[PDB]
Amino acid sequence: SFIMRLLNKPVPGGVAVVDLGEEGPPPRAFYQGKPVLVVREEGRRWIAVVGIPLSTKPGPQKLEVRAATGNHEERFSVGSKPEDLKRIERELAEQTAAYRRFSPGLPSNLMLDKPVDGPLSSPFPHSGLDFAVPAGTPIKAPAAGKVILIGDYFFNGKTVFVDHGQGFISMFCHLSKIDVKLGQQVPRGGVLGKVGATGRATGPHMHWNVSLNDARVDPAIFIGAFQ
């Protein structure tokens, strides 16, 4: 499928699309103990869309599949490519918990829109994708989702997490303005807020993280810009 052609980039920091050998009731899947996004491929076979951490050594990998008719493992391959620290600890803990959220819903779209209309800057260590846009540029939801975290953090500044469903999560930080509320359900294209330089940034810094199964992956894969 087109979504297999787009998303199957199995490298460290990348994405593996794995045939689950299931077509009936929805199976559950786990990679390194973390629950993984499971969707029908254009309404047909069940596939996992698996985030591969950047620290993953190339080689064979295992996915645990759970189904009523019996559990099984499916292998795939990764190829090569100031002031109180107590606050900081708490802020790290909140963000860590947010990426580990696994809500039951299916993502509205797996191919994501660019969150800002501007050129890409820094890759994807740098755990996301930058865009060269000025402060005040509106940031739009790459897919539909629920706002599961809003913070004003020491390092990341004004930060918003959007849960697209089943661990598929966008994060945006250093915002000047956040226009959404905690728990708010936003459509694809909904305005989340405005680009800024809050937290530890040197000038306007539009930063976008994409996570799958608690693994930060290259957002360029989802917009068709891998690389």
Least distance between Zn ion and beta carbon 1 (Å): 31
User: Is 174 marked as binding a ligand?
Assistant: no
- Cα separations in angstroms, 182 against 32, 96, 105, 187, 194: 29, 17, 18, 15, 16
Q: What contacts 24+ positions apart, CB below 8 Å, involve 118-125?
A: 118/206, 120/220, 120/225, 121/206, 123/218, 123/220, 123/227, 124/13, 124/218, 124/219, 124/220, 125/54
Residue (34 or 216) nearer to Zn ion, CB = 216
Does residue number 207 form part of the binding site for Zn ion (CB under 5 A)? yes
In the set 130, 155, 201, 220, which binds Zn ion (CB under 5 A)?
130
User: Is 130 marked as binding a ligand?
Assistant: yes
User: Is 164 marked as binding a ligand?
Assistant: no
Q: Which stretch binds Zn ion (CB under 5 A): 26-34, 52-60, 108-116, 129-137?
A: 129-137
- CA count, 13 A, side-chain hemisphere, 102: 14
Least distance between Zn ion and beta carbon 153 (Å): 14
| Element (DSSP H or E) covering residue 221 | helix 219-223
CB contact at 8 A, 157 and 193: no
Q: Name the residue whose CB lies closest to Zn ion.
A: 207
Least distance between Zn ion and beta carbon 128 (Å): 5
Residue (58 or 123) nearer to Zn ion, CB = 123
Binding site for Zn ion (CB under 5 A): 130, 207
Q: Which residues are annotated as a binding site?
A: 126, 130, 205, 207
Q: Which residues are annotated as a binding site for Zn(2+)?
A: 126, 130, 205, 207
